[PDB]
């Protein structure tokens, strides 16, 4: 409903790498990508808004 | 070749990624691929030691 389609141009070598990891983790490619990117994003934002020393 | 990846995401996910992409002055695409490729690299190397 509220959802969005985010469309990524990517190098075929990158798709291959991500697919291999998703297979190891037994995750959909989308789940692997979004979980990793959001995890990295929270870190970036907390680094700037809280762990700013 | 170059390829196309469609990701269905939550709007709160897109909003979060874009906020961090802006902070780093990086395109959303570059932020997402770079973090996911870095994580993937890490995943295959920890698997290789299991074998």
The portion of residues forming beta strands of chain A comes to 15-25%
How many H/I helices of chain A? Answer: 2
Taking the alpha carbons of the first and last residues of chain A, their distance comes to 40 Å
Please state the oligomeric state of the protein chains shown.
homodimer
Radius of gyration of chain A from CA coordinates: 14 Å
> Strand count, sense and closure of the main sheet of chain A?
none
Question: Helix proportion of residues of chain A, in percent?
Answer: 55-70%
The chain pair with the largest interface is: A-B, 35 and 34 residues
- Derived structural class of chain A: alpha+beta
Q: What's the order of the H and E elements of chain A?
A: EHH
What is the approximate shape of chain A? extended
Family (chain A): Belongs to the TacA antitoxin family.
Protein name (chain A): DUF1778 domain-containing protein
Keywords (chain A): DNA-binding, Repressor, Toxin-antitoxin system, Transcription, Transcription regulation
Organism (chain A): Salmonella typhimurium
Short description:
Chain A: One of its GO terms (biological process) is regulation of DNA-templated transcription. Two copies of one chain form a homodimer. The first copy, chain A, has 53 residues and is of the alpha+beta class.
């Amino acid at each position: 409903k509220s959802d969005v389609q985010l469309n990524l141009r990517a190098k075929e070598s990158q798709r291959a790498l991500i697919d291999a990891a998703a297979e190891i983790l037994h995750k959909s490619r989308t789940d692997f990508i979004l979980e990793t990117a959001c995890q990295a994003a929270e870190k970036v934002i907390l680094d700037r808004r809280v762990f700013n020393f």
